[PDB]
Symmetry: C2
């Protein structure tokens, strides 16, 4: 199963401070066909704001796994891609969201499990967290005002994943 492939994209939110962003991320995942959410040390979860921003994606919140470390969140993944909003001076392969989606599909088609890792509001992932990833993904943005809202960033990546998944089906 085709739609079922999308369940093997593991969205990992690292140390999210605003519970509204957890809900927003779940909504962004559900409206692209994704469903697997993992939270590393969220600051406030469960929370009413996550439920409200999920706007019906409460199934994803209820099935979300909450873990103490990024290592636990990445267990069993065939590849890990971390997002970066700025030059991090780490020489890892740097992908745009379209290239990220191509890499994701390649793994999903090979029965892999892909982690897409998002960091804290503003600060992003730490260097150590980025070093744990095999690829870095950057959403091209205005360098004068470069970091997107966490849920909006999840939406951009999940949208590209769905665009690649549709294209592979001749759709």
């Amino acid at each position: 199963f085709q739609s079922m492939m999308l369940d093997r994209i593991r969205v990992v939110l690292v140390n999210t401070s605003h519970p509204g962003n957890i809900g927003g991320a779940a909504r962004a995942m559900k409206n692209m066909g994704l469903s697997q959410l993992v939270l590393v040390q969220p600051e406030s979860f469960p929370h009413g704001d996550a439920v409200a921003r999920a706007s019906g994606a409460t199934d994803i919140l209820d099935a979300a796994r909450v873990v103490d470390t990024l290592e636990e969140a990445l267990s069993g993944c065939s590849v890990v891609l971390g997002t970066s909003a700025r030059d991090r001076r780490i020489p890892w392969p740097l992908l745009d969201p379209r290239e990220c989606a191509t890499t994701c599909l390649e793994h999903l088609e090979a029965n892999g499990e892909v982690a897409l890792v998002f960091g804290r509001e503003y600060a992003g992932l730490t260097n150590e967290e980025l070093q744990r990833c095999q690829f870095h993904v950057h959403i091209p943005s205005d360098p004068e005002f470069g970091s997107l809202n966490l849920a909006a960033a999840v939406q951009v990546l999940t949208y590209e994943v769905r665009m690649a998944w549709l294209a592979a089906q001749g759709k």
Copy 2:
């Protein structure tokens, strides 16, 4: 000017009910280089929630024009593109976000002014509002759970606009 071209994309939010979405839209515009926001009959504006979700894109909120009708919001535009989340049974040309961005760039390069029109949370634009547009833009989504958060939808379209704008510059 190149960056200046993006100021000629007019983001129009029609009858927004959650002020947080107005702020989220302004943030989504600013981190892609856009700045022109027009609000048609927003339910609560100005509002603290718009300021909070703008996360520093308060300049866009302060310069936003508030009007009573969609007609006033579209004055002087060379083309109007409206978003749709479902089959609207209106036979207008239907573009995905990449095709929307191509159309936008074509107009910006020809010193045009493009309106990107977003509707109400859940309900979207009315048929009459969609009929006022020359093109309809649909973000491919899971038809089981098809409508994105308003600010996340603005982010998807603005992200594609920036991707097209960068590509045209050999970047």
